[PDB]
Amino acid sequence: GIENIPATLSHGGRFIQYNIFGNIFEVTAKYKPPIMPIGKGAYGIVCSAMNSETNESVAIKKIANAFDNKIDAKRTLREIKLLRHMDHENIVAIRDIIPPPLRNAFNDVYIAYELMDTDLHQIIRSNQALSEEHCQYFLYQILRGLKYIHSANVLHRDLKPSNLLLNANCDLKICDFGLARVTSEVTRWYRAPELLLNSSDYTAAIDVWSVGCIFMELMDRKPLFPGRDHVHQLRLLMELIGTPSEEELEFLNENAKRYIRQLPPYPRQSITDKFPTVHPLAIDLIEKMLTFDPRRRITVLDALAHPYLNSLHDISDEPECTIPFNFDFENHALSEEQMKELIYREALAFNPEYQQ
């Protein structure tokens, strides 16, 4: 579909501006036309493109005005550094950081990721059927990636179906680390119990919780805990799981502890009866993942060995991250110009021709 989107050579031919419904999408010259818009959102837009020098297809996301609010600049730099630090088959890889044509005028950041066909959210929405071996493969790859992320002392704090990208090969990669934790510091249908009822510190269990939810949504094709309001989330939680007994309530803040005694009782509805279509071992592990108590929640390391995944589980093939990740990129307090400069050095690392 070339010449469908107007493409103008700019800055001495080293860049190409693509008009996309009045949205100027400027990338380096090696990404010759055509490009295919594939995503929209708050960050900006996402197009597919081909690197004419490497014959490799990427997805270029454009974060527009990335440095205006310093919080969003920190989430962008955090995204780049986090995704560059890690090398894993269930983690989305950065393939390029576009240099700005003019360093003084560096407002938009274009990141290029490896190209994926869809994501689990779209798979759910399209109402398309999956063999049980496929669901098995998906869950296994999610946990296999979580093992690595956590092994780098990083907690992916916002897991969603739209965060799990897929391929026709059924390869699944985790993405969008804009909110991850270093243990040193938005829909909540997937947020853990401890996150809503503030326990100021949380462990990897939060991720496990979300996975549980996600897997049920994969197996039931309906959102497991839809929230009308923030207070309602807990209601639909304990309506299904049951109101905890305080052998389980010990951990949350006592400003939050009182909270749970404040409400009427809730029986533990059995999941095998509410969602009976799914396989039995699936229901088992799902129940073992959605415990209200964080210290009574199954670990990713143990959830890998659960019998639902026994045809895929393998400790020698599920690696960890050797070198951990530190949060002070250069230092702790940075201005928008410092973060700008770091991302600029990264783009110059991917594009040594623009260093000079």
Q: Is 18 helix (H, G, I), strand (E, B) or coil?
A: strand
Maximum C-alpha span of the chain = 70
- Report the C-alpha dihedral over residues 294, 299, 300, 301, rounded to 10 degrees: 160
Overall resolution, Å = 2.8
* Closest C-alpha to 340, from 66, 154, 129: 66
Task: Confirm or deny that 1 is annotated as ligand binding.
Answer: no
- Report the C-alpha dihedral over residues 251, 295, 230, 191, rounded to 10 degrees: 150
Task: Confirm or deny that 43 is annotated as ligand binding.
Answer: yes
Distance CA 95, CA 60 (A): 9
Find where tokens 């107007």 sit: 6
Residues with catalytic function: 158
User: In this structure, what token pair is assigned to residue 91?
Assistant: 């983690």
User: In this structure, what token pair is assigned to residue 2?
Assistant: 């070339």
Q: What is the secondary structure of 266-311 as a DSSP string?
A: -----HHHHS-SS-HHHHHHHHHH--SSGGGSPPHHHHHHSGGGTT
Task: Confirm or deny that 212 is annotated as ligand binding.
Answer: no
Distance CA 233, CA 218 (A): 19
Give the determination technique.
X-ray
Distance CA 143, CA 93 (A): 18
- Report the C-alpha dihedral over residues 215, 130, 318, 84, rounded to 10 degrees: -80
Contact 23, 49 (CB under 8 A): no
Contact 196, 188 (CB under 8 A): yes
Instruction: Give the residue numbers spanning the domain of 146.
Output: 118-317
- Report the C-alpha dihedral over residues 22, 20, 120, 227, rounded to 10 degrees: 10
- DSSP label of 100: P
**Could you report how far apart the first and last alpha carbons of the chain are, in Å?**
35
Contact 159, 207 (CB under 8 A): yes
Residues 6+ apart with CB under 8 A from 350: 96, 97
Beta strands (DSSP E) in the chain are 7-10, 15-20, 23-28, 36-40, 44-51, 56-63, 94-97, 109-114, 118-119, 164-166, 172-174
Distance CA 313, CA 326 (A): 30
Q: Is 72 exposed, middle or buried (0-12, 13-18, 19+ CB in 10 A)?
A: middle
Contact 257, 249 (CB under 8 A): yes
User: In this structure, what token pair is assigned to residue 86?
Assistant: 């890690």
CATH number of residue 269's parent domain: 1.10.510.10
Task: Confirm or deny that 227 is annotated as ligand binding.
Answer: no
Q: Which strands make up the sheet holding 15-20, listed edge to edge?
A: 7-10, 15-20, 23-28
At residue 115, φ and ψ (nearest 5 deg) are: -85, 130
